[PDB]
């Protein structure tokens, strides 16, 4: 099963505060209107990790207890716990249907959303908790951890969504209080390309150069 991601998946890319300003960044992002893949627990298979993941679920039971990461299931684990959350690394091995060495760590109707981005050896996590298909609308996942270290699985009647990040260029609008109030994925369509080329969310009637383009060479030959 699938759903359109709409505009969800923005997150603060690097939290140098900005307010009442438009600013542009380029990173791994979930493309707007990406094809989010919808799962139900009523098995929960391994998925590739690719360049990184958007994850969200709306189960009120907190039945989604955690995740596991890396090939062979050296690995990274992250599990919620009683009044806690924990992480660890080993070449663990555990059964393929789980339910409730280095760098142990401990820390602390709602839609819970998460982004897992693995960059420069840092396994960044961004999140938000919001009251509740993926509900069409806009909000930014706030940063939550940056601990450092290819396929992953969730740790367990409940359902959740997965989408994969890709490189994209975004324009972000910061509200007066420095919350990201809206965004445009510049790759999405010619109108979005125009918006990014003009650095504005609204564009006056007219014609604009969006970019150059070229027929890329299909082949290489030598005499």
């Amino acid at each position: 099963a699938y759903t359109n991601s709409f505009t969800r998946g923005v997150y603060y890319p690097d939290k140098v505060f900005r307010s009442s300003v438009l600013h542009s960044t380029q990173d791994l992002f979930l493309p707007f209107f990406s094809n989010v893949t919808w799962f139900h627990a009523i098995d929960n298979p391994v998925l590739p990790f690719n360049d990184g993941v958007y994850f969200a679920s709306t189960e009120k039971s907190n039945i989604i207890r955690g995740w596991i990461f890396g090939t062979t299931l050296q690995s990274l684990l992250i599990v919620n716990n009683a009044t806690n959350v924990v992480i660890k690394v080993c070449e663990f091995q555990f059964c393929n249907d789980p339910f409730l060495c280095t760098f142990e760590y401990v820390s602390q109707k709602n839609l819970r959303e998460f982004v897992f981005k693995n960059i420069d050896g840092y396994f960044k996590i961004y999140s938000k908790h919001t009251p509740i298909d993926l509900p069409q609308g806009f909000s930014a996942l706030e940063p939550l951890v940056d601990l450092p270290i290819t396929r992953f699985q969730t740790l367990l009647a409940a359902a959740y969504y997965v989408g994969y990040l890709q490189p994209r260029t975004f324009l972000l609008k910061y509200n007066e209080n420095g919350t990201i109030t809206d965004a445009v994925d510049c790759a999405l369509d010619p109108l979005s390309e125009t918006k990014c080329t003009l650095k504005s969310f609204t564009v006056e009637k007219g014609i604009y150069q969006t970019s150059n383009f070229r027929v890329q060479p299909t082949e290489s030959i030598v005499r």
């Binding site: 010619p190 109108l191 390309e193 969310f201 564009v203 009637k205 007219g206 150069q209 969006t210 027929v215």
Partner: peptide, 30 residues
């Protein structure tokens, strides 16, 4: 290059490739 009616007029849009034949890359006009 992008042709726009102005954003809050509509999100409808058209696009012009300024110096190419068609048949290289719907409703199309050469």
């Amino acid at each position: 290059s992008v042709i726009t009616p102005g954003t809050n007029t509509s999100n409808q849009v058209a696009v012009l490739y300024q110096d190419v034949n068609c048949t290289e890359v719907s409703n199309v006009f050469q």
